[PDB]
Design a protein around this motif. Structure first.
Motif, PDB file in Angstrom:
ATOM      1  N   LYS A 198       0.868  -1.144   0.010  1.00  0.00           N
ATOM      2  CA  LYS A 198       0.002  -0.110  -0.054  1.00  0.00           C
ATOM      3  C   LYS A 198       0.878   1.306  -0.010  1.00  0.00           C
ATOM      4  CE  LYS A 198      -0.565   1.999   3.879  1.00  0.00           C
ATOM      5  NZ  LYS A 198       0.790   1.177   3.898  1.00  0.00           N
ATOM      6  N   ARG A 199       0.324   2.271  -0.575  1.00  0.00           N
ATOM      7  CA  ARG A 199       1.076   3.575  -0.460  1.00  0.00           C
ATOM      8  C   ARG A 199       1.000   4.159   0.897  1.00  0.00           C
ATOM      9  NH1 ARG A 199      -0.603   5.573  -4.947  1.00  0.00           N
ATOM     10  NH2 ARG A 199       1.197   6.033  -6.161  1.00  0.00           N
ATOM     11  N   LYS A 200       2.123   4.733   1.236  1.00  0.00           N
ATOM     12  CA  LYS A 200       2.193   5.066   2.764  1.00  0.00           C
ATOM     13  C   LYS A 200       1.690   6.526   2.649  1.00  0.00           C
ATOM     14  CE  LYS A 200       5.242   3.700   5.608  1.00  0.00           C
ATOM     15  NZ  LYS A 200       6.642   3.151   5.954  1.00  0.00           N
ATOM     16  N   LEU A 201       2.712   7.385   1.851  1.00  0.00           N
ATOM     17  CA  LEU A 201       2.447   8.788   1.495  1.00  0.00           C
ATOM     18  C   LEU A 201       3.217   9.235   0.144  1.00  0.00           C
ATOM     19  CD1 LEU A 201       5.694  10.044   2.106  1.00  0.00           C
ATOM     20  CD2 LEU A 201       5.109   9.202   4.673  1.00  0.00           C
ATOM     21  N   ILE A 202       2.964  10.372  -0.136  1.00  0.00           N
ATOM     22  CA  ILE A 202       4.137  11.110  -0.865  1.00  0.00           C
ATOM     23  C   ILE A 202       4.661  12.352  -0.172  1.00  0.00           C
ATOM     24  CG2 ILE A 202       2.771   9.988  -2.931  1.00  0.00           C
ATOM     25  CD1 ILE A 202       1.825  13.049  -3.446  1.00  0.00           C
ATOM     26  N   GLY A 203       5.944  12.437  -0.799  1.00  0.00           N
ATOM     27  CA  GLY A 203       6.640  13.600  -0.184  1.00  0.00           C
ATOM     28  C   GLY A 203       6.992  14.659  -1.569  1.00  0.00           C
ATOM     29  N   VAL A 204       6.712  16.030  -1.223  1.00  0.00           N
ATOM     30  CA  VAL A 204       6.498  16.861  -2.519  1.00  0.00           C
ATOM     31  C   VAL A 204       7.368  17.931  -2.258  1.00  0.00           C
ATOM     32  CG1 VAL A 204       5.137  18.053  -4.120  1.00  0.00           C
ATOM     33  CG2 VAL A 204       4.187  15.847  -2.929  1.00  0.00           C
ATOM     34  N   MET A 205       8.193  18.422  -3.564  1.00  0.00           N
ATOM     35  CA  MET A 205       9.123  19.509  -3.471  1.00  0.00           C
ATOM     36  C   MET A 205       8.683  20.363  -4.770  1.00  0.00           C
ATOM     37  SD  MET A 205      12.799  17.892  -2.471  1.00  0.00           S
ATOM     38  CE  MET A 205      13.706  19.487  -2.734  1.00  0.00           C
ATOM     39  N   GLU A 206       8.406  21.464  -4.275  1.00  0.00           N
ATOM     40  CA  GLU A 206       7.654  22.372  -5.533  1.00  0.00           C
ATOM     41  C   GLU A 206       8.589  23.661  -5.340  1.00  0.00           C
ATOM     42  OE1 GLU A 206       3.339  23.215  -5.643  1.00  0.00           O
ATOM     43  OE2 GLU A 206       3.870  25.254  -5.615  1.00  0.00           O
ATOM     44  N   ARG A 207       9.395  23.870  -6.743  1.00  0.00           N
ATOM     45  CA  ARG A 207      10.123  25.215  -7.102  1.00  0.00           C
ATOM     46  C   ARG A 207       9.334  26.309  -7.283  1.00  0.00           C
ATOM     47  NH1 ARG A 207      15.248  26.015  -5.427  1.00  0.00           N
ATOM     48  NH2 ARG A 207      15.547  27.942  -6.290  1.00  0.00           N
ATOM     49  N   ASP A 208       9.640  27.122  -6.233  1.00  0.00           N
ATOM     50  CA  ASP A 208       9.085  28.631  -6.442  1.00  0.00           C
ATOM     51  C   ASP A 208      10.067  29.496  -5.603  1.00  0.00           C
ATOM     52  OD1 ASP A 208       7.885  31.355  -6.246  1.00  0.00           O
ATOM     53  OD2 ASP A 208       6.001  30.118  -6.962  1.00  0.00           O
ATOM     54  N   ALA A 209      11.046  30.142  -6.142  1.00  0.00           N
ATOM     55  CA  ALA A 209      12.216  30.991  -5.521  1.00  0.00           C
ATOM     56  C   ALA A 209      11.525  32.121  -4.657  1.00  0.00           C
ATOM     57  CB  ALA A 209      12.988  31.711  -6.393  1.00  0.00           C
ATOM     58  N   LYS A 210      10.476  32.747  -5.182  1.00  0.00           N
ATOM     59  CA  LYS A 210       9.881  33.859  -4.369  1.00  0.00           C
ATOM     60  C   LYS A 210       9.057  33.327  -3.231  1.00  0.00           C
ATOM     61  CE  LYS A 210      10.413  37.255  -6.291  1.00  0.00           C
ATOM     62  NZ  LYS A 210       9.379  38.168  -7.189  1.00  0.00           N
ATOM     63  N   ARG A 211       8.149  32.273  -3.689  1.00  0.00           N
ATOM     64  CA  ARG A 211       7.125  31.886  -2.230  1.00  0.00           C
ATOM     65  C   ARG A 211       7.798  31.100  -1.398  1.00  0.00           C
ATOM     66  NH1 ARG A 211       2.807  29.370  -3.933  1.00  0.00           N
ATOM     67  NH2 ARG A 211       3.497  28.417  -5.767  1.00  0.00           N
TER      68      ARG A 211
END
Ligand code: HEC
Ligand code: HEC
Ligand SMILES: [Zn+2]
Ligand SMILES: [Zn+2]
Lengths: 136, 137
Positions: free
Chosen positions: B76-89
């Motif tokens: 079973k999928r336990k989690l996803i980790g996410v990295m989202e690029r936005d130098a300002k925010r």
């Protein structure tokens, strides 16, 4: 008569992965971490549709190393390839089978027209000789 | 701090790599299991040696596994980790926003500290724009 090397397969849809460790009946020759990739035509087959000619599945097999309770991908051992052509590959049930040693295009491995490969996949007749199921 | 978007359709993205983390590894909690790294088109640019453009997204897809006669099988999928690029925010966290989605579900956000904890460990990889994964053939 020959299966094409599936150029650009690395950017296809990753279907699943499995680890095969020493002691498993398929350690020879399938030992390692493997990944299955499907092109767009294969996905239609996998989804519950039928397999269009030109559908390709790739078995991408790596050696792994143990690194402090992590299994880490080492060197590519081989890719296996199934290429759908109902008419041309009808002798092995509509799929052409080929192995490329180390994923190298020049190192074709299959010498028997893919009879050996088919002999195992034939058990999966009812799902068009594919073992892999699509997951979430 | 503003929220990291759920990466709809990440499963279609380019598979960067996989790794298995077993009991006893430093990262067992919370990263134990089989994970796969996925990257959108914009993230591939950074991986191949460019700068990471805003909109670059990396995903860590974590599954449980079962051991069954010397085979490890994805459960079973336990989690996803996410990295989202936005130098300002995402300036506070080196230009990446970090989030966790329990079981990969959009409602199940795991990060409570504005991604500071994630960032703390990712910081060691300052030199490669805070990304651990490397592109292989
Ligand atoms: C049993 C003794 C096998 C022989 C000989 C061959 N294959 Fe096979 N294959 C086998 C299993 C159990 C699986 C599923 C593994 C999984 O992760 O679920 C596979 C899978 C493939 C795939 C991926 C597509 C699929 O059917 O799931 C390909 C592209 C594939 N196999 C190709 C292949 C080739 C080229 C072979 C001879 C060189 C071959 N296989 C032999 C079982 C067995
Ligand atoms: C310390 C160790 C940590 C902590 C606290 C977090 N991460 Fe990250 N992370 C870590 C490693 C060693 C790796 C590489 C895995 C591999 O090599 O296969 C990762 C990977 C990611 C990824 C994939 C992208 C990449 O390689 O950088 C993502 C999207 C990611 N990690 C996100 C993430 C988030 C959201 C975290 C807090 C909830 C987090 N990590 C913590 C090391 C560490
Ligand atoms: Zn130990
Ligand atoms: Zn075992």
């Amino acid at each position: 008569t020959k299966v094409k090397y599936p150029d650009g397969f690395r950017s296809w849809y990753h279907v699943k992965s499995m680890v095969i460790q020493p002691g498993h009946p398929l350690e020879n020759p399938f030992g390692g971490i493997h990944h299955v990739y499907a092109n767009a035509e294969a996905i239609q087959g996998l989804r519950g549709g039928n397999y269009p000619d030109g559908a390709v599945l790739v078995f991408d097999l790596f050696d792994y190393q143990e690194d402090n309770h992590a299994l880490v991908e080492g060197k590519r051992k081989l890719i296996g390839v199934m290429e759908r052509d109902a008419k041309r590959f009808s002798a092995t049930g509509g799929w052409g089978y080929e192995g490329f040693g180390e994923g190298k295009p020049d190192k074709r491995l299959v010498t028997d027209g893919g009879q050996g490969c088919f002999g195992c996949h034939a058990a999966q007749k009812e799902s068009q000789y594919v073992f892999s199921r699509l997951r979430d």
